[PDB]
Design a protein around this ligand. Structure first.
Ligand code: ZN
Lengths: 134, 54, 214, 149, 64, 195, 99
RNA sequence: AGGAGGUGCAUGGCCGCCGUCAGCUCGUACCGUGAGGCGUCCACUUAAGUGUGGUAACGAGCGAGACCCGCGCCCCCAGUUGCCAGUCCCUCCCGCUCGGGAGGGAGGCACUCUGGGGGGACUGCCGGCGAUAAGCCGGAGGAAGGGGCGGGCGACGGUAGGUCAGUAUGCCCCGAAACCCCCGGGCUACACGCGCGCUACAAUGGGCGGGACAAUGGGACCCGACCCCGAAAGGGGAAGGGAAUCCCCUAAACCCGCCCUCAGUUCGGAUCGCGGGCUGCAACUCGCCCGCGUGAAGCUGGAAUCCCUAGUACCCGCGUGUCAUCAUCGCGC
């Protein structure tokens, strides 16, 4: 038995497969334990800690992430892992725990980049050159 | 012997490209081979089929 | 340099930074208690959310707010310690990893020096650096009058955090002291109430001016 | 264990230390007098930077093989300080990469697939896997969460 | 602001006037009925018309 | 690439259209279109006055074929003429006719009113004509005549409304004429009916 | 097998041509792979609006979109003869390959 | 004939601004001798002359709205040039293999993705305010709560606002010259004042070795993998790609280890010497690139002043337009 889930953030897409195993979570071929920076590692690891030790050791996950930066990839992996755990467990208690902790774990982030416009487009959409007057 | 009032063959530079519609230098839009002066392209694009959905 | 266990630290419980708990942290004043957030959260990182929502800062962890505050450049259009600190490409703005590391180091230093919870020390510093009265102009008839007014708890907290961050930046600026060391010193001095802390000095000055214009 | 199971920096430094004993891998006669890339400012501060570079190249061939000189140059490039002009990314010199790949091939750790690049020989795979497994065995005591992998 | 346009108001009023028994207080029903009984072609326009009609029926039931 | 062929065809038809309009402005030019066929290409041109387009003795058509072949590079072109579906509904022909009348010497006010009345008699939701230039004095000015329903701003305005512009070369300068017409049966999104 | 590449500046013409090909294929009874819509090629050109330099800078973004579809059809005499006579409107462009 | 010769105070066309402001008008009627007035006013509401009610007015047109494009969630169809999760075979590696990992084949489209058609969000519901309506502030649910978020579309008129040096064009002028070609020089000068930017005045760092992660676009005298030579710039051969098949393309900021430890310094990178290359018919006036050597102001800034409300500002790199070479530049990512 396997379960597949997907997560998206910025421009990063993460596809996660959850199965029964020894609790070895691997991301892009690397163990999750040696992921850097520490902030990204914690971001990826939060759902497992929330779920608990027994479930973490019971199930294992394999994740493939493409696109975006390190933070975006970590967030996408976090979302995919949370969805996979929720679906696999099938219980609503941990689902409510996830909702009250961070509502966006199961619901993706809809924010995207605002297109640039003239008058310093390279700077950004609302950025503009300063006037001189006199 | 009457070899004058002739334009030298130029392969590169601002003098090697003319606006087909009006015959101009600096600028010429040659994206996808348009070879169209910027003003002419601005006033002709709808006929060519470009749309401004921005 | 740092030990491999610390480099690859793996938390197992829901506590701030995965190292310090908030069970024993106490807030004395009732004004700031509702807004001072001690919710269990190991990653103080909410991204840009809660900015759109009005009064959405009341549900953001203290450490997240401090990290965001220190993630800046200092100076710009204001002078603290009578100097500008316009650092453009050397600033921490938009570098949450660096801000997080700075806060972690500062908390470690505070814990080592004091023997008490760094979050508790931060709460004491915020309490001692939170002003209570200010002066503002009011327009009646055809002329304006300076009048002393109260400060809402949210503004108290924001001013306290801003003062702490500016003080740390000022005393780390162009010196031998690291930014984390400066932040730890700022928090310790603010908690201890000695005028040496910029936050406490600014609170005293604001209160004195409020009394004068009262 | 596998190369994927351990941090890159520790594995590459260990691999360079091991490669120090391989007679085929020796610095070129111009190694003392050459910067690693056009974007760099001053010479390397390590008297044995050649072995570190060779180890990194071997790891890159292992992970992303087949690879070529141009792609390795792109990887080994970086930002440059152009002075008053804004900084820009630049590639690295190809001589170091070419010589390192030739030396690795002579040692037998790398074999060239025509028109595709350089892949890792089974000998090189065994070498890297052995070093990685000893490194993981060392790391297991320090951190006990890697025992299940 | 979310204020009904003149043509939306007039269309909803005339529809409810002509067909009093074909509209109820359920927006899901009202949108379908508006679609069948009118040649509207835009989701937003049809939705706004249906909402206004539902409000009209609610007021009628209230008796005002 | 694929886009090169499309861009080349568009440029070629634009050049041919402009040249043919310049050559046949007096024949109520309305437009043209091309169709590729295995033997070659067939171009059909809409003209309200075929007589002039055909010319006399089959000389103008021969010259036009020769030009469209050698100058513009079209391969094996077959030129055909057709009647305008509604001469009073397309602005380009009407603008050209009004410019021709202005050049002839008819007073601008009466000419504009006559053209506008003719358009609305032939059928149109709305019409709007602007004349700009040295009208009634050295100081230039712009005047507008309008009646009916017309749209100027929005996607319906850019799609449904048909626009045309022309310049009349008077003795003492140039006068710009702009014509906007709303064809009958155009339905705005605002107005809807009940079934 | 035969590869059909159809490109056009309007979606409806491509839809009609694909529907015609689908009708031919289903009438013949041979296996057909549904039209694969390749990524649309959108070319954008930004041009300064003003014909001179005076005035605040403002630009217009002209855009042209080309839509492409791919079809794979089992190669047989009757079907290939039946699809060689497609209407192929002026805007649509057709490319035939055999493999 | 030709004119990049004057005239934008003779013009057409397009563009900035007042202004994405909400205003500008018409038919009949009414008042005033008349210029004009009413509707278009008053109270509330809206981003809006947007809407409700009162009214000497009743109706309508152009603006606004509406409309079109893209983003965000779900459903149907489609599966190659796109994707590889399950299943089978082959090869290789490790702790010698309980177990684990990598590549290729057949195979699948399951997930991502591409692109056509649909659903969804409509103040829809609950409480409150407003008058019970116009509407407004919160809450539930939800991907998206209040114009869902960002764009295109700029009315009657004016601005003798800029453009004849983009095209068109009236009059005047040159008309063997102001017309047309060719060579050389200039537009690149330099006591000085100013606008907008890049680099910095360092530890919120410089250097060295190592370790990770994108997207938009472009590619036929074109992009160029891959191989060989060179210390770098760069040179020689050359597969595939007419581009979901190949290339530009393993970005930087960020992370780990070491040196530097507050100093005009291992900050700063101007200014100059020698030498080696690339493009170009031609490189001194007047191009760009790399090696060694050199090492000027600058240690945070007066009065004053500018941008920005969320994936926005800041920080940091990349694509393209200009292009034989040259990007501290405009437009986007
Ligand atoms: Zn032109």
């Amino acid at each position: 038995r396997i379960i597949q889930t997907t997560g998206k953030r910025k421009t990063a897409i993460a596809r996660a497969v959850i199965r029964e195993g020894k609790g070895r979570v691997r991301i892009n071929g690397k163990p999750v334990e040696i992921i850097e920076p520490e902030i990204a590692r914690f971001t990826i690891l939060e759902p497992l800690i929330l779920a608990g030790e027994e479930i973490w050791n019971s199930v294992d996950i394999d994740v493939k992430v493409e696109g975006g930066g390190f933070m975006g990839q970590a967030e996408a992996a976090r979302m995919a892992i949370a969805r996979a755990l929720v679906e696999w467990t099938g219980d609503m208690s941990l689902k409510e725990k996830f909702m009250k902790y961070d509502r966006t774990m199961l619901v993706g982030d809809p924010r995207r980049t605002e297109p640039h416009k003239p008058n310093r487009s390279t700077k950004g959409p609302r950025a503009k050159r300063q006037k001189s007057y006199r | 012997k009457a070899d004058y009032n002739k334009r030298k063959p130029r392969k590169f530079g601002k003098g090697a490209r003319r606006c087909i519609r009006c015959g101009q230098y600096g600028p010429i839009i040659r994206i996808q081979g348009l070879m169209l002066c910027r003003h002419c392209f601005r006033e002709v694009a709808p006929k060519l089929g470009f749309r401004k959905y921005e | 340099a740092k030990p491999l266990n610390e480099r690859f630290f793996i938390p197992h419980e829901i506590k701030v930074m995965g190292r310090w708990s908030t069970e024993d942290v106490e807030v004395r004043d009732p004004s700031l208690k509702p807004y001072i957030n001690l919710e269990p959260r190991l990653l103080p990182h909410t991204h840009g959310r809660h900015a759109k929502k009005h009064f959405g800062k009341a549900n953001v962890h203290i450490v997240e707010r401090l990290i965001n505050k220190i993630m800046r450049s200092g100076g710009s259009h204001y002078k603290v310690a009578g100097h500008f600190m316009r650092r453009e490409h050397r600033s921490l703005n938009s570098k949450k990893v660096k801000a997080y590391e700075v806060v972690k180091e500062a908390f470690k230093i505070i814990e080592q020096r004091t023997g008490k919870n760094p979050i508790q020390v931060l709460v004491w510093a915020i309490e001692n650096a939170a002003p209570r009265e200010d002066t503002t102009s009011v327009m009646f008839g055809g002329i304006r009058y300076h009048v002393a007014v109260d400060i809402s708890p949210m503004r108290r907290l924001d001013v306290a955090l801003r003062n702490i961050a500016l003080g740390a930046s000022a005393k780390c600026y162009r010196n031998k002291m690291s930014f984390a060391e400066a932040l730890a010193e700022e928090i310790i001095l603010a908690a201890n109430k000695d005028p040496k802390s910029y936050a406490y000095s600014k609170k005293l000055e604001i209160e004195r001016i409020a009394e004068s214009s009262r | 264990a596998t190369v994927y199971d351990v941090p890159g920096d520790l594995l590459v430094e260990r691999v360079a230390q091991r490669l120090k004993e391989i007679p085929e891998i020796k610095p070129p006669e111009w190694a003392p007098f050459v910067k690693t890339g056009r974007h760099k400012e001053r010479l390397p501060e390590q008297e044995d930077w050649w072995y570190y570079r060779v180890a990194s190249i071997l790891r890159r061939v292992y992970l992303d093989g087949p690879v070529g000189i141009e792609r390795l140059r792109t990887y080994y490039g970086g930002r440059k300080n152009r002075g008053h002009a804004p900084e820009k990314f630049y590639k690295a010199g190809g001589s170091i990469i070419r010589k390192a790949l030739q030396q690795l091939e002579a040692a037998g750790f790398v074999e060239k697939v025509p028109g595709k690049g350089r892949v890792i020989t089974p000998k090189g795979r065994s070498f890297l896997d052995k070093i990685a497994t000893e490194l993981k065995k060392e790391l297991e005591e320090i951190i006990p969460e890697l025992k299940k992998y | 602001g979310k204020i009904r346009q003149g043509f939306i108001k007039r269309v909803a009023r005339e529809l409810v006037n002509k067909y009093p028994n074909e509209f109820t207080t359920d927006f899901e029903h009202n949108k379908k009925k508006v679609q069948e009984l009118t040649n509207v072609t835009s989701k937003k326009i049809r939705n706004r018309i249906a909402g206004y009609v539902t409000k009209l029926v609610r007021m009628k039931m209230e008796g005002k | 690439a694929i886009e090169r062929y499309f861009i080349r065809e568009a440029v070629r038809e634009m050049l041919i259209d402009e040249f043919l309009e310049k050559e046949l402005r007096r024949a109520g030019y309305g437009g043209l279109d091309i169709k590729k066929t295995p033997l070659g290409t067939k171009v059909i041109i809409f003209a309200a006055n075929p007589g002039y387009v055909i010319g006399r003795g089959g000389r103008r058509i021969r010259e036009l074929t020769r030009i469209l072949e050698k100058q513009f590079g079209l391969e094996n072109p077959q030129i055909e003429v057709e009647e305008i579906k509604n001469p009073y509904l397309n602005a380009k022909v009407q603008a050209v006719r009004l410019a021709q009348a202005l050049e002839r010497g008819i007073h601008f006010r009466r000419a504009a009113y006559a053209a506008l009345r003719a358009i609305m008699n032939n059928g149109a939701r709305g019409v709007e004509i602007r004349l700009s230039g040295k009208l009634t004095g050295e100081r230039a000015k712009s005047i507008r005549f309008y009646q009916g329903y017309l749209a100027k701003v929005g996607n319906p305005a850019e799609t449904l409304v048909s626009k045309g512009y022309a310049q009349a070369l008077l003795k003492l300068g140039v006068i710009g004429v702009k014509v906007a017409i709303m064809p009958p049966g155009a339905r705005l999104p605002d107005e809807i009916e009940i079934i | 097998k035969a590869r059909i590449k159809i490109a056009s500046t309007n979606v409806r013409s491509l839809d009609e041509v694909a529907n015609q090909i689908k009708q031919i294929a289903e009438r013949t009874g041979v296996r057909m792979s549904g039209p694969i819509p390749l990524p649309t090629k959108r070319i954008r050109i930004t041009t300064r609006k003003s014909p001179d330099g005076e005035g605040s800078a403002t630009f217009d973004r002209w855009e042209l979109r080309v839509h492409k579809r791919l079809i794979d059809i089992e190669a047989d005499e009757r079907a290939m003869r039946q699809i060689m006579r497609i209407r192929v409107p002026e805007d649509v462009t057709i490319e035939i390959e055999l493999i």
